[model samples]
Target: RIRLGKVVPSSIRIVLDCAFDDLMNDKEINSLCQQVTRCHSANRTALHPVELFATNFGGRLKTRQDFVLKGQQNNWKRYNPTTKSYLEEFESQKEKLVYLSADSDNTITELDEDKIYIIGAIVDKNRYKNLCQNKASEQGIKTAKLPIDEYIKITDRKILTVNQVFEILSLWLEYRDWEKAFMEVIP
Candidate 1:
């Protein structure tokens, strides 16, 4: 086992915003949940992402951490709120909620320690464009894309899946190096 030490900041939070409007049916919702399952699998092997990643279940879709795809434990916890989103709960703690998007012109060169970075909880096949950006505008939250253009070359589309984005962010948080994080997280 490769035992690694992670220096994840205690103040920063990685929130998967699952309150999108496009998850119209059970199939899409289940796909999102399955992607979340892949995210959890990535979390376990990581020394950092496991601690900072959180799920925001504002869409009211069902979530299951006990997936049997690979016959392993996926300890993902959905943030069930009775009143507001788990992102809202962070408001009381005074967190700057920033949405991460690939379409946004604003790029995050550095991860803020006091910010709660949110990724759109989507498992899509390029069906929707600027979905997360639109939602962020509707909620009046800040939107910024990852600094991929500044550091690394893109192999595929600039748009990243939920798990890939979270892993990159967590690796950046741990190593404080965007290039290394992007390379290590990809594939």
Candidate 2:
């Protein structure tokens, strides 16, 4: 008897790009699946949840999510699971794509409701440098990073977990302030 909460879906779309599945090992893939699950759970409970999408959802990532989510994979509302890449999934809206990459020089100050943000769903521990940025560039899509340095200073690298990034975006949608969202979400 697990009752769901009232979900207020936002027009902003947050994509967890799963194209990096082949770059990760078994343990990393397991961790990535767990992160995706956490992102979904966070979104479900958020005051204003964005349309969460897991794109390129085939291979090991799909297998792991299917096992982890049990039989509820296809039943979750507000969660879109697609085997096609984000480029293919959002073919018509390609101009709105903004790949969030740590290596990107562009820092996103605010989340635009009209733009679609994509977070690389990889747990590579910085093994692949400029991975997302390069991919986005190759695809002719724009790339940007979170405005972490503008509001707060962190000791560790600015790289955040998938769920953390997703939750930060969710919190930003709720408060509409980057400083507040960063203070609450970033550790």
Candidate 3:
């Protein structure tokens, strides 16, 4: 366990939409679990860690966390664990929910401290295109992509990993400049 020293919590809420467990294989689940663990660690060490929530956290992911990971979720600090979906959990704050999807037409210019940003917890490896966007659209929730092109250029598709998205958000909170945050966090 890392000794947390003088950690400051941010008002921003970052949620890992872990409802895609059924869409992943065992290996992908393992990878997703590791990514979630990395996100948790990054938030813990961050200067302004946001409220982290893993919604719909069950099935194979839960099994791995409970057995292979040795109940690591129990030891995680400033983390919310819920079997309820994000829609169910944040029912009252539905308008404040913004799903971060790379396929979205809208690019987020700045982070809204009051909005709850959600990153889809899926490792489809491009098998499913616009998966997150479609889900958010169907659910009537707003979707926005990171302002990557505006700040920096990339060679291939702009799709980033789950941890990368979380880190970028965290870095943005600290730097307040998208370019600096993208350069520092995106590898």
Candidate 4:
């Protein structure tokens, strides 16, 4: 566990190690969530990763011309927010790499590998509220974000867990008869 000034990089080993094989082979996670999360940092005003190594965690960046080659194992790059570019360098020399790590989040793509993920940094209540506010955007019942305190009541035994949103929706639609699908399920 590496401790930065305020941010603690507890799961860097897990995240980077998983990617060691993939990123080393230059394999994209091939996941929309993975892409969106990285893009949020690269494009949106959302959170940005603190650089732990020379290569920024997110980009289809160029070599040398954009980032300088640092070491065989570790590549370093200075990130430029203005142009959304990174100046390259190496980081393998340092015993520890400490910056904002993508490993701490659950934005991985579909793969058969076991993953250690990060979740719940920004509740983004404002974003949730904005979703709620845009209730009229849907075809019929424009959806909105539920209150943070909203508790989901279990109503069906088939739904072993409601963590994955896809599962929750399936169960809700199945028994709900398509009415008030988000109702409290009385198991």
Model 3: ten consecutive residues of lowest lDDT:
1-10
**1 or 3, which is superior by TM-score?**
3
> RMSD, model 2, all Cα superposed?
3.3
Worst 10 residues of 2 by lDDT: 1-10
Best-to-worst ranking by TM-score = 3, 2, 1, 4
Off by over 4 Å in 2: 1-7, 151-156
lDDT of 3 by residue, 31-143 (tens): 98889998998898898898999999999998987876777678888899899999999999999999999889899888888999999999998689889999999999999
**Residue-level lDDT tens digits of model 4 in 161-183:** 11222222222323322223234
Worst 10 residues of 1 by lDDT: 74-83
Candidate 3 segments whose C-alpha is farther than 4 A from its true place: 1-7, 151-155
Better of 1 and 2 by TM-score: 2
User: Candidate 1 lDDT, tens digit per residue, 1-187?
Assistant: 3536753424566677766634546676666667666666665565554334444553434334333344333334322223346456665653378889887868888887778888887767657888888877777788899888665466537777787888787677667788888877764
Query: Per lDDT, what order, best first?
Result: 3, 2, 1, 4
Q: Model 2 over residues 53-80: C-alpha lDDT tens digits?
A: 8898899988887887787878877899
